[PDB]
Amino acid sequence: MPLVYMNIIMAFAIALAGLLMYRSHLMSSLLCLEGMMLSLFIMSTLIILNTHFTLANMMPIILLVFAACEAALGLSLLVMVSNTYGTDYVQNLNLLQC
Amino acid sequence: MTMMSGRPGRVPLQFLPNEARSLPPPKLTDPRLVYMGFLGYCSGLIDNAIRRRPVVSAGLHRQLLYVTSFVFFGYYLLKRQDYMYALRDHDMFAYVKSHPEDFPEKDKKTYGEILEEFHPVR
Amino acid sequence: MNIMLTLLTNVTLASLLVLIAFWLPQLNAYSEKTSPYECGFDPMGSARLPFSMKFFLVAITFLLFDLEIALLLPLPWASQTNNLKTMLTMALFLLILLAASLAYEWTQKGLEWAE
Amino acid sequence: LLDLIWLETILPKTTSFIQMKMSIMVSNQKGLIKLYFLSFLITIMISMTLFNYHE
Amino acid sequence: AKTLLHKYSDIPEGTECHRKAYASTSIGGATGLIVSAYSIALKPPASFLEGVARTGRYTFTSAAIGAIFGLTSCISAQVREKPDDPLNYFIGGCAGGLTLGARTRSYGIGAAACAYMGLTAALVKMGQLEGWQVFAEPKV
Amino acid sequence: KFYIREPPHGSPDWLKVGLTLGTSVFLWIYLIKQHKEDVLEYKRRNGLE
Amino acid sequence: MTMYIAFILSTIFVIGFVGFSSKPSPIYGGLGLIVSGGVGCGIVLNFGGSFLGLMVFLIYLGGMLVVFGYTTAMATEMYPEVWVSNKTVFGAFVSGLMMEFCMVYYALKEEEVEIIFKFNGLGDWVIYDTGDSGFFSEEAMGIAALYSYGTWLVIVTGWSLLIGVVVIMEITRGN
Amino acid sequence: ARQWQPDVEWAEQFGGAVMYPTKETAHWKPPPWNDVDPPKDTLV
Amino acid sequence: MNPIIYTTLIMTVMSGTMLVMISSHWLLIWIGFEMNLLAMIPVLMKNFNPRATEAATKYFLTQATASMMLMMAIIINLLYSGQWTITKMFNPVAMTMMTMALAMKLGLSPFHFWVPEVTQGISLQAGLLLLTWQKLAPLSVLCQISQSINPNLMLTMAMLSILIGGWGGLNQTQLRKIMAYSSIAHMGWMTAVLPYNTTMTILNLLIYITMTLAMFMLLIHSSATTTLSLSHTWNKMPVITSLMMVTLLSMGGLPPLSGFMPKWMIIQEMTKNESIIMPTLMAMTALLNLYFYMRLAYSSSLTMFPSTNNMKMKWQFEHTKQMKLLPTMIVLSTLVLPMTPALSSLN
Lengths: 98, 122, 115, 55, 140, 49, 175, 44, 347
Ligand SMILES: CCCCCCCCCCCCCCCCCC(=O)OC[C@H](COP(=O)([O-])OCC(O)COP(=O)([O-])OC[C@@H](COC(=O)CCCCCCCCCCCCCCCCC)OC(=O)CCCCCCCCCCCCCCCCC)OC(=O)CCCCCCCCCCCCCCCCC
Ligand SMILES: CCCCCCCCCCCCCCCCCC(=O)OC[C@H](COP(=O)([O-])OCC(O)COP(=O)([O-])OC[C@@H](COC(=O)CCCCCCCCCCCCCCCCC)OC(=O)CCCCCCCCCCCCCCCCC)OC(=O)CCCCCCCCCCCCCCCCC
Ligand SMILES: CCCCCCCCCCCCCCCCC[C@@H](O)O[C@H](CO[C@H](O)CCCCCCCCCCCCCCC)COP(=O)(O)OCC[N+](C)(C)C
Ligand SMILES: CCCCCCCCCCCCCCCCC[C@@H](O)O[C@H](CO[C@H](O)CCCCCCCCCCCCCCC)COP(=O)(O)OCC[N+](C)(C)C
Ligand SMILES: CCCCCCCCCCCCCCCCC[C@@H](O)O[C@H](CO[C@H](O)CCCCCCCCCCCCCCC)COP(=O)(O)OCC[N+](C)(C)C
What we know:
The structure is cut from a larger assembly and holds nine protein chains of nine kinds. Chain E is built from five helices and no strands. By secondary structure, chain E is an all-alpha fold.
């Protein structure tokens, strides 16, 4: 496979590692999630263009749509977290244990 | 891991194919139907107990509906189960018939000519 | 190729304008001169402190409505299909639900800024 | 020595002690998602290297 | 990786005891590294040097157990001239358990580990001999 | 005796009771008829009678 | 081979991904995601997908504007972090840059199976199709087919968007 | 002569946040009776 | 929440699950998962409090990461074969990523960490939904791709789930965390037999759902979320504690109760594939779940704990809301072993 495919897959892996390795801010993790969605969009678009599969030219757009939903959902949750603590720090989400 | 979902000529959501009508239906005094009715009766008694009603006497119409529903569902459940087992055996016999080299009929020896090791107990 | 050259030219022109602005004139910079402006006086707090957003719900709603733009821009090409009855039904259906979602947010006081 | 001590020690008391220690080790997670998701990353890497490289 | 397992198992039982010990040391070190990674992820050490020390402790313990087990089992196999005998694995595993007890400096842990690891290693030898399958393939 | 409404009074809810008994009777009649038709179809297909 | 413009664009894509995944202040993470969106638009345009690239760029511009507002509201601190103001952030950034460099080197100088399969290089231009026909754009036709072929997709997408409005209304209610 | 039944001392063994309390987990508190934590005075 | 809005959200969750289970296209399965999650988040926060918000945030982060991985696996599979149909994954890397994403969605070890916390942070009705309905879609997807799964990875995760469920449940005084650890162990049991027989997976799922519904309904009836709160129920509703004790015995798998039938059917199936060590370990480990069920039964029904004076007032009032399917659920959770052959209707 070309270097571009591996570059896009590397971008996805980097975004997933960024999501899995947390820092204080929840917004940074939300940005990593959106980056994973962007990399998936690019990769699927490249495959669909390369193989000239005409009817899946619509699936990345639908992909984008649900990305927005996730983003909206996440932002909503962040608001509530902030309203409880005054920060979006993931440290504050420790009321529940295993 | 999925044995019979992809069987050819299978309609997706029938629950009871037409060929199943070739099988003898379960008798209404089937012990499995009687057990299903017993389960319905137990459900009715538990319903009386939870609602703090006289357990044996309170809802005779309600207990009757419990028993009737359980028996009604159990009849069709038993029909489907019997049909599935009949299909299993039908396919097994057809496959054995179509693959004689995989299920050979070997000549069987008598016990007077098979040498079995004897193990004394002492 | 021509668009890349155009972008390079525009960015280069702006960058050289910035270079000329910072290297031509005489610079006399001191701490009083470079301090933050708040009309006569030293700021009480930091400008990096949280600044509350009263239209936060409308901002989230904008995200979902911005992707409705993604679903409707292929409409000029969709009008060239043979089965126009199907596409018109689906194009109208998509605009109706967008209108209903705006109506739902409007009636539930979602478009009102936080007090 | 035998019934009250050592026969208790080997089969039932050892089992109870081992299960209790394992329960304490498993259940004592502080509830911080940073640690959980770091362990998730470790698990994903291990599954990609030890199972996905062997087929 | 099962490549290390093959590297261990390709060498016959009572032959080349040094290479058997090396392969088992590698397997133990890998196990200890994985244990230390999970432990550091789930229980942060509050310092980088303390995390390095904990990783070194866990990995050295596991590698030492592996080396002791492999060397003891191979030597017992070659001296007694009895390969394919689970008691060599029992002796190796019980020596490894004693090593674990010495490393943690606990007599009770040492005895329990000696017994349990010896029995487990003997069971693994019996499974190798009889073809017992842990992850059985879907035959039927 | 009782002080307040007590929705189940001396007369039981006759609509609900009638519906319950009717459902049970309908299910029983349907099951009997279904069993008879099943027996007839099985005998016709297998040539017993 | 052919000026490796697409390879440069994909490398900048990875660099922006490392920029926002090292997680500085969300201001700079948003900027990094904007850069990645632009270069991804460029990558898709170089393969014939003008509409898809432009639309993903537009969508991510809107999303990053909302994220900037939300960052100013709820993700600020006294001293927002840049890639060189923190040892952890700088370490993550440099590690990502170096492991990208390692992958690129090991892929272009020799042919190795990194995780899935192998690669030799040869540039993107090899895998093109050289088809010669048409008074239309195939991408536009496939996207416009959503209103004639993708009725089910339109239904589920519209339902999800309406439900998303209701859901964000419910979550931020409080009480 | 009556059958033994649990008393308060027996019952308090099950009232902690966990069974088998350790030194780390002894500071864990049981959740509030309703699932509502007191508001924090994080004035903005 | 408005009741109409609540009904709409519940039906959207159900519609997402149905979309997952009727689709032949990978994109529609992904869309079903997204719709399910989007409608599921507000249901967890129906009773607003900091704990519910934290539970919803953890749940969304876990499920969104799993969804990203799932879409990545779909795209890799498409790249190595221009296929969108859910039949059998053509790339082993894509298969591994898909298995990990589905395990993360289900909460199988080592992706089990979120299951107790979320279950503790939400109400009992939300916990009922989360532990019963949310398992259908990933398990259906796993059943459809069963032939492609690598047995070693799946069996490792299943054994880990059983072990961790038992060990974690041993330490719990809160009932919601007990139910969560029970759920993790049962999920391990379900996924252990998946590469061999999906009908056994379905049977175990149905039985576990019945018993879980019975327990959650009994816990809602006697509004108890801790062991000590449940220890008061004998002094107000002894029948409820008796039924709970019998259902707990069934969940532990003791014969002649129904909960024995799944394990009995699974072990047996595994022995048809020359798998003995794993079934033996699985049963011996399910002993731990039985132990903490027995401890709950000791504290709840087999002995009598001290009560409070104000309980006298509760003696004067009945339960306002009646659960129609609770009696059927209890009877199905206990007395269905003699009808075991009926499982043939599930294939
Ligand atoms: C397609 C699926 C695949 C997807 C994945 C693909 C990924 C590709 C992209 C990778 C590039 C990354 C780009 C951006 C990532 C963003 C990271 C981030 O934001 O950090 C946030 C995170 C939290 O930030 P923060 O809260 O603001 O700062 C808090 C302080 O840092 C801490 O404050 P404190 O003082 O209180 O804490 C004390 C100190 C304590 O620090 C420590 O204890 C760690 C030191 C352990 C020593 C290790 C032993 C040394 C030798 C081992 C070598 C093995 C072979 C040796 C063989 C035998 C030798 C004879 O810090 C910690 O507690 C942190 C623990 C976590 C350490 C790293 C986590 C990795 C797993 C855990 C195991 C660690 C190694 C154990 C040994 C296992 C084998 C290596 O930062 C960190 O945790 C540390 C900096 C991380 C930067 C490096 C990240 C790059 C690694 C990525 C994955 C590696 C390769 C992946 C696959 C490769 C093969 C396929
Ligand atoms: C079902 C029906 C009934 C059956 C069930 C009931 C019976 C079964 C269980 C009965 C008891 C068995 C328990 C096993 C050992 C438990 C150790 C323990 O609890 O540790 C916690 C406990 C806590 O320690 P800690 O908290 O870490 O530190 C505080 C210490 O107290 C501070 O300690 P310290 O500073 O005072 O001194 C400690 C130090 C020094 O200890 C001392 O100060 C005093 C000296 C003690 C050594 C005595 C040796 C001289 C006499 C023995 C003669 C040869 C053996 C018999 C041969 C018969 C010949 C015909 O210990 C050592 O250095 C000893 C290291 C190794 C030497 C002994 C190991 C020999 C193994 C036996 C081989 C047998 C092969 C088969 C033979 C077949 C042909 C007949 O450790 C101890 O205190 C005990 C230390 C003594 C250990 C060796 C004693 C074992 C005796 C033979 C065991 C074999 C039976 C099991 C066979 C199956 C295994 C695979
Ligand atoms: C605790 C005991 C279990 C209780 C379970 C709940 C009981 C209530 C369920 C209500 C019954 C109605 C369901 C079905 C009615 C019609 C729908 C029918 O057409 O569906 C068929 C399917 O039939 C159903 O599966 C039959 C359900 C009967 C379940 C009973 C088995 C229980 C095991 C033994 C315990 C005894 C239970 C006692 C009963 C009270 C379609 O087959 P198919 O589309 O191709 O299969 C899809 C899945 N595949 C392809 C992957 C295989
Ligand atoms: C519309 C956009 C396009 C326009 C096209 C022209 C683009 C021009 C690029 C922008 C820069 C022009 C700014 C005009 C003033 C020059 C600024 C600077 O370059 O001159 C001095 C450069 O001097 C350096 O500081 C030191 C001189 C030498 C340094 C070594 C460089 C190598 C030279 C070696 C000489 C050998 C012979 C070279 C000629 C062949 C800086 O002095 P400094 O005081 O700091 O800053 C204040 C400048 N003031 C005084 C005018 C207000
Ligand atoms: C069985 C139960 C029925 C009631 C419950 C249904 C639950 C799901 C909701 C609606 C189900 C929709 C299923 C029908 C799928 C549409 C595709 C099919 O019907 O044909 C289309 C028919 O499309 C029609 O326009 C019907 C669509 C109208 C539906 C829109 C509104 C109804 C949805 C309401 C429920 C959804 C959620 C709530 C929204 C407010 C296009 O056909 P056509 O283009 O000729 O030829 C295609 C082949 N070509 C392209 C090669 C030429």
